[PDB]
């Protein structure tokens, strides 16, 4: 049945935790890495996206964006807009962009969940902005 450390929640074979003390994308992912096989959350299916949405939906109006583990280390130079990858190195096998970055001139190079989409869809976002964030890890 999957158990998790007190303070996180189980889904599938992973544990998930929302952190409200805001960090840049890089610093948030580094914080997640303190946990066993930890990284910013990767969203690998619609079902997982729904779970993550439910984890964060009660966050409160102080917050409209939450970091997830997707970033573009090509900083937009990938010829197709497809340099995006999960920090966990999982295959990108599910896509839930609010707006596809390939349609935006000079998009942000990290991705967040947006309150406007009930935290179900991804918004390109400035990596240097400090946001709350969700970690996905094993126990
Ligand atoms: Zn894992
Ligand atoms: Zn990377
Ligand atoms: Zn740029």
With b for 16 or more beta-carbon neighbours within 10 A and e for fewer, the 100-122 pattern comes to ebeeeeebbbbbbbbbeeebbbb
Q: Which of 36, 40, 9, 31 is nearest to 125 (CA)?
A: 40
27, two tokens: 């610093």
The resolution, in angstroms to one decimal, equals 1.5
Q: How far is the CA of 12 from the centre of ligand 1 (A)?
A: 10
| Ligand of minimum distance to the alpha carbon of 76 | 3
Which approach determined this entry?
X-ray
According to the 3-state scheme, what is the secondary structure of 81-105?
CCCCEECCCCCCCCCCECCCHHHCC
| Ligand of minimum distance to the alpha carbon of 75 | 3
Q: Which CATH class is domain 1-139?
A: alpha beta
CB 139 within 8 A of CB 38: no
Write down the domain spans for the chain. Answer: 1-139
Q: Which of 104, 123, 103 is nearest to 112 (CA)?
A: 123
Q: Which residues are annotated as a binding site for Zn(2+)?
A: 14, 71, 85, 109
């Amino acid at each position: 049945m999957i158990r998790c450390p007190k303070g996180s929640k189980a889904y599938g074979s992973h544990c998930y935790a929302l952190f409200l003390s805001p960090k840049s994308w890089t610093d948030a992912d580094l914080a997640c890495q303190k946990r066993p096989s930890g990284n910013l959350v990767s969203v690998l299916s619609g079902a997982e996206g729904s779970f993550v949405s439910s984890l964060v939906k009660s966050i409160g109006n102080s917050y409209s964006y939450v970091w997830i583990g997707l970033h573009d280390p090509t900083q937009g130079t990938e010829p197709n807009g497809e340099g995006w990858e999960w920090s966990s190195s999982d295959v990108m096998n599910y896509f839930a962009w609010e707006r596809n970055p390939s349609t935006i001139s000079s998009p942000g190079h990290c991705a967040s969940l947006s309150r406007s989409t009930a935290f179900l869809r991804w918004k390109d976002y400035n990596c240097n902005v400090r946001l709350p964030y969700v970690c996905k890890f094993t126990d």
